[PDB]
Design a protein around this ligand. Structure first.
Ligand SMILES: Nc1ncnc2c1ncn2[C@@H]1O[C@H](COP(=O)(O)OP(=O)(O)OC[C@H]2O[C@@H]([n+]3cccc(C(=O)O)c3)[C@H](O)[C@@H]2O)[C@@H](O)[C@H]1O
Ligand SMILES: Nc1ncnc2c1ncn2[C@@H]1O[C@H](COP(=O)(O)OP(=O)(O)OC[C@H]2O[C@@H]([n+]3cccc(C(=O)O)c3)[C@H](O)[C@@H]2O)[C@@H](O)[C@H]1O
Ligand SMILES: Nc1ncnc2c1ncn2[C@@H]1O[C@H](COP(=O)(O)O)[C@@H](O)[C@H]1O
Ligand SMILES: Nc1ncnc2c1ncn2[C@@H]1O[C@H](COP(=O)(O)O)[C@@H](O)[C@H]1O
Ligand SMILES: [Cl-]
Ligand SMILES: [Cl-]
Ligand SMILES: [Cl-]
Ligand SMILES: [Cl-]
Ligand SMILES: [Cl-]
Ligand SMILES: [Cl-]
Ligand SMILES: [Cl-]
Ligand SMILES: [Cl-]
Ligand SMILES: [Cl-]
Ligand SMILES: [Cl-]
Ligand SMILES: [Mg+2]
Ligand SMILES: [Mg+2]
Lengths: 696, 696
């Protein structure tokens, strides 16, 4: 009848065994206080999901087991079934596993059967899928575990648990949406509870597909579904957004946070198993298509999941899943990201080159949002967060209440004007900093620039001129770039010495402000301020950035943003001749951010090369453009793209948000020395155009 | 690139080969006029899905083939791929099949692999599932087909079509929601179009699950999905509600009618196949879990599904599916049902015993609704419907415009008052008839009743008395029943002779007015007016009936319904003693229609016997009732149920609406001679109660 189960989101850290252990323990202790008899944790939670090439290392395996032993001998784990994740090597093959134990015995080790090998995922690099479906083998335990557990071997493979009162089965992360998912046969076999341990990272706007899936599955097959997921940054450019859930028969009973500053969040629910049994009768109490397939092996477990609590235990009522707006998503994720980055880097704060333009502004807003979250958290009684703030600012007695106050201690904004900067942009940056609370620095680079160009003249005997002073296209560009790069040099100097100049220990993380759209076209200066330490908006669309900044006005009460939004998007690096005004980035690029986004998505999402893309747009923009015209747009896109790709190889690491990122380290593997005339492809395009231009 | 496909709903009639053929032809001719190159029809459309035990008959097989030949030699079928359904016997085994042909050749015969064996479905009685998955065998054609088609054999089995431009696959009705559905592997294999031929009957409120499924499937796997379904009554108590659809990548492009008076409704859509290809790339352009399964056999077809039309052919835009309210569902289905029943029975009209109570009223409303639909249809240019009305009323020149006018010619209502009927009920019936237009008859049964009881006295020397005149419980009941049955005798007399008495040829179908709730408890008199020819509200809940009638007030403008709703639900068959008023049916039954519905659903839907049901309610009604109390309610329910079940065996056939029907012929097979003390079960219940009553 009535059972009480727990799932959870943990902020795990790659190879951080000590912390990882304490987090797992805490969740189990929490679940037990709430009356749970089964606890589900995230995929590979013992070592942290993102260990990458450390999985090749045997030490990883070893410590994981030492962590497992600690769990097994811990008095908290008594009388609750615990499903943890670690790597495990069986017969010289490395598997991504679930280790399920109860009262100092291992019940079953259950290896993953479908591995993620797309986008940021590459599990086949380190793990093998279990291929012997509906079968188990005897796994031989480490003497370390034997001595403790008093078992020689345990079942290893595709099996389910049978207890005195129920039948629980495992579905690991992506097995949930893999063709022919375990949950189908488990359902058929009569499995009433299905646990899914995830490690899925944030992706702007796609939170609902996870929820929908679990929902549909429970709706279609009946049953309780448990989903646990990592939450936070585990040591790289991903943010895991654990929307841990508990679903039954198509309804949701517990909704876990997508972004929060909690290291441990536990969901429970009290459900009557008979609701499953009667909901399944409601559908098909009959037989099926006559399948006669090999049935699931069964691990007998001497334990009752439901135990006497009924007399008081309130049944969980169904709930509606509340989603975040896309702007709320943006204001929360990169924000919580930046918080883990700061706290785990053990760095003294951030250094933000603030230009008075939209992106640098958005970046500033993310920090302010971070501060708010921290204040919220501290108010909420979050000891970990309080501990951390106190450690970051060095003040034992400190207690952030006003976000502007915390911000000041944590953020240093820096406006670096050139000879041609307007008074307006300088002002806007000054105002925005004033409003969020940051320590603002305003300086002029021109003395350093004059000096560099002096060195050049001194040695070549030649003086480059700006385009407006009769300079060549090359000279103009070079000059612009020098200023860009001097800014970067200065940014790092302050990162390294500004706190020093204020009488205080420590150094700052440099933050970048490239957006995903310009990153793709390479419309940036190699090694200017586009290269920093971390970039939180690197993966966000320009349009979304504007959207996010306009949303910040009212949510954070920052009026300084209006002028910033209204101002013309221009880079004041070159003097303006009489009769003309500044050129906008969109004219500079030779395409609007809108249409740039389309190329982006057609390229990475829809997997189109130039010919394919030419054909798509030809129809999409059939009214607006002519065949010759789209050819030119596409050609212009691919050439600029290819010419600039090398800029991508060295680009600052970015929070992952859009599934159309051009990021080269993990998500978008590509050449960087292309033939930039695309002779063959472009010829195909021409032929098509010529063919169409034969119509009357 | 761009293709144009058609699916359809047909009003097929069991064994009605001539008509069935003409309907299939018409749809194909319509699809071709709309530019379709593939046409999909419903499950077993050649013979009509509901042939039942006629499937055992070889003639069925034979004529189906003669119908197939007619299709093959027909000039309309040229240059369109046609997917029809018939039974087919291969190697002495009978399969439910799809026959796909193009230009006088059979491409592939594709047999069903999961058979429906639940509720009203019992396909295993006549058909065998195809068990050799991903395999085909040579089917040897009838000489009849050979001579015509010039082929010795064709592929028979699990295969897909490959054309010059696309890949089309088959999913038959329930295979869509069977574990491990064809659409998963077909998707994996690269099948871009999937056709599903259905024969699913109406079920109140469950229309969305069909739509959701197709939607989710296309969303999850990408692709175009086509669904065709029978629409109307094919010769029995089911109404097929063809919500034929066309879906792609998660959106709907065409929505077919659930209830209409069309014999043929064709949906088309013009879709670009490249949208599929680019939507699938969007998800997983990679590889999967490494499955290495036997792949689908491929029938090469020398045909291009897309042919030059692009230059003009508008792409279909996505649409939102519009559902009917439950009351709209009720006002339309049974209505369209009654229309096919009337027209195919070749009967002159209906005869409705109208009591001045809610159910008889609802029944009247269904007829009025029918008339409206017919008027609507005729206005809409529907020749078939016009032809039929003209044939039913015998007037060549007739053209229904006013629904009250048609109603008058088609409906005869009959109020049969006893000695104890009130003037109020008589009035209400008179008024409702006036308002809908029916020929109303009002009479008094008492002369016939006196006469029967005279015969009894004359021969036994004894005079039974009503309870209020000192009569025994048995006498009272008997007397009541006699009146009930005399009403039935009279109803059939008018059915058979009322038109005659009005100078006009023909006879009437007697309509019944039992609701699903009282049918279950047996709260009716065996062979009273509860037994008629057909009952359209036999499967509808009392609460829904009240809901439907209140909705009719404003939709049909019938004020007479208000008093009918407001009036006390009492059966005026026995005289009332001084000091007391009439007893309501709900007190008579010893439970409210509400709680009766719960028993109904817990019983048939949730598959609970008395013990199970006692346990469910014990929790459901934990605040409201005590354990001893629910025991009594349940016990009272099962006993009355069991005592009365025999009434079910002979009960009038009813439109199917609720999936908790107690109908004995098809949907709810049960004993009818029970041990009505349920000694064992009831003892278990007592033990549980006694156990609980030991708590303080
Ligand atoms: N295939 C290849 N593989 C490896 N390296 C390759 C290469 N092709 C060129 N390179 C080299 O890469 C280097 C590129 O760097 P660099 O020479 O500095 O020049 P680069 O970064 O290519 O040009 C900077 C761009 O930034 C734009 N800009 C201007 C002003 C302000 C802003 C702003 O928004 O902040 C942007 C400006 O319009 C210009 O197109 C060159 O030395 C070039 O020789
Ligand atoms: N196990 C079994 N298998 C086969 N047959 C069985 C049987 N048990 C009894 N039977 C027989 O079935 C027959 C039942 O018919 P019958 O004797 O007429 O009587 P019956 O139909 O059982 O009683 C009629 C019921 O209708 C109710 N009623 C009264 C007034 C108006 C209305 C209304 O709403 O219209 C309803 C009334 O309260 C009463 O409970 C009996 O002859 C009985 O011997
Ligand atoms: N005036 C400025 N003050 C501080 N940072 C700037 C300034 N101008 C540009 N940046 C940085 O350079 C990048 C944008 O280049 P640009 O478009 O030329 O302004 C971003 O990473 C900015 O943070
Ligand atoms: N006064 C009446 N006039 C016509 N039909 C009636 C009348 N009373 C009952 N019926 C029929 O008998 C059934 C209901 O029985 P009762 O509840 O006793 O009215 C329904 O099938 C009615 O159509
Ligand atoms: Cl060892
Ligand atoms: Cl077993
Ligand atoms: Cl230091
Ligand atoms: Cl800007
Ligand atoms: Cl902008
Ligand atoms: Cl033959
Ligand atoms: Cl093949
Ligand atoms: Cl006649
Ligand atoms: Cl009533
Ligand atoms: Cl009523
Ligand atoms: Mg900007
Ligand atoms: Mg009524």
């Amino acid at each position: 009848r009535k059972v009480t189960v727990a799932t959870c989101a943990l902020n795990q850290w790659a190879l951080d065994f000590e912390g990882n252990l304490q987090r797992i323990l805490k969740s189990i202790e929490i679940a037990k206080n709430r009356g749970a008899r089964y606890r589900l944790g995230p995929e590979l939670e013992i070592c942290g999901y993102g260990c990458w090439d450390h999985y090749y290392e045997s030490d990883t395996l070893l410590h994981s087991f030492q962590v497992l032993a600690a769990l097994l001998e811990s008095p908290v784990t008594q009388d609750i079934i615990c499903d943890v994740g670690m790597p495990v090597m069986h017969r010289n093959v490395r598997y991504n596993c679930r280790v399920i134990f109860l009262n100092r015995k291992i019940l079953l080790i259950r290896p993953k059967m479908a591995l993620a090998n797309e986008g940021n995922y590459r599990e086949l690099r380190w793990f093998t899928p279990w291929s012997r479906s509906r079968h188990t083998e005897e796994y031989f335990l480490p003497r370390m575990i034997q001595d403790l557990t008093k078992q020689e071997t345990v079942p290893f493979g595709d099996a389910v648990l049978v207890t005195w009162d129920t039948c629980i089965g495992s579905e690991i992360c992506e097995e949930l949406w893999t063709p022919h998912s375990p949950h189908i046969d488990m359902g058929l076999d009569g499995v009433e509870i299905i646990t899914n341990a995830s490690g899925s990272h944030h992706v702007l706007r796609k939170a609902n597909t996870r929820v929908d899936l679990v929902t549909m599955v429970t709706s279609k097959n009946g049953g309780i579904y448990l989903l646990a997921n990592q939450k936070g940054c585990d040591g790289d450019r991903l943010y895991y957004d654990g929307c841990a859930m508990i679903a039954m028969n198509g309804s949701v009973f517990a909704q876990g946070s997508q972004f929060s500053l909690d290291d441990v969040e536990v969901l429970t629910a009290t459900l009557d198993l008979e609701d499953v049994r009667s909901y399944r009768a409601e559908i098909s109490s009959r037989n099926l298509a006559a399948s006669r397939a090999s049935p699931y092996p069964r691990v007998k477990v001497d334990f009752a999941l439901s135990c006497h609590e009924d007399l008081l235990a309130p049944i969980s009522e169904p709930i509606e899943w509340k989603y975040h707006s896309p702007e709320e998503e943006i204001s929360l994720g990169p924000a919580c990201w930046l918080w883990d980055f700061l706290r785990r880097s053990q760095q003294a704060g951030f250094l933000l080159p603030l230009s008075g333009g939209v992106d640098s502004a958005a970046t500033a807003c993310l920090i302010y949002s971070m501060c708010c979250q921290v204040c919220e958290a501290v108010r909420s009684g979050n000891e970990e967060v309080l501990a951390d703030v106190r450690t970051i600012v060095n003040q034992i007695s400190y207690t952030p209440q006003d976000p502007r106050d915390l911000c000041g201690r944590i953020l240093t904004t820096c406006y670096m004007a050139s000879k041609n900067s307007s008074q307006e942009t300088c002002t806007r940056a000054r105002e925005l900093a004033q409003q969020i609370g940051s320590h603002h620095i305003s300086l002029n680079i021109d003395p350093a620039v004059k000096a560099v160009m002096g060195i050049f003249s001194l040695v070549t005997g030649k003086s480059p001129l700006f385009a407006a002073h009769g300079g060549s296209s090359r000279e103009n560009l070079a000059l612009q770039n020098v200023q860009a790069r001097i800014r970067m040099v200065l940014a790092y100097l302050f990162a390294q010495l500004s706190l020093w100049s204020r009488g205080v220990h420590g150094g700052l993380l440099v933050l970048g402000s490239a957006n995903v759209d310009e990153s793709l076209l390479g419309y940036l200066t190699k090694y200017d301020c586009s290269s920093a330490d971390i970039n939180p908006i690197g993966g966000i669309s320009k349009t979304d950035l504007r959207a996010f900044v306009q949303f910040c006005i009212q949510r954070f009460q920052l009026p300084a943003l209006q002028s910033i939004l209204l101002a013309p998007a221009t880079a004041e690096l070159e003097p303006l001749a009489d009769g003309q005004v500044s050129q906008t980035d969109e004219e500079d690029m030779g395409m609007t951010y809108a249409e740039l986004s389309v190329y982006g998505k057609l390229r990475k999402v829809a997997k189109m090369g130039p010919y394919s893309m030419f054909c798509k747009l030809l129809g999409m923009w059939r009214h607006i453009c002519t065949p010759r015209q789209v050819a030119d747009k596409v050609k212009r896109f691919f050439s600029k793209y290819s010419m600039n790709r090398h800029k991508m190889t060295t680009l600052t690491p970015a929070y992952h948000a859009e599934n159309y990122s051009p990021e080269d380290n993990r998500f978008d593997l590509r050449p960087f020395l292309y033939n930039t005339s695309w002779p063959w492809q472009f010829r195909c395009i021409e032929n098509q155009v010529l063919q169409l231009e034969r119509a009357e």
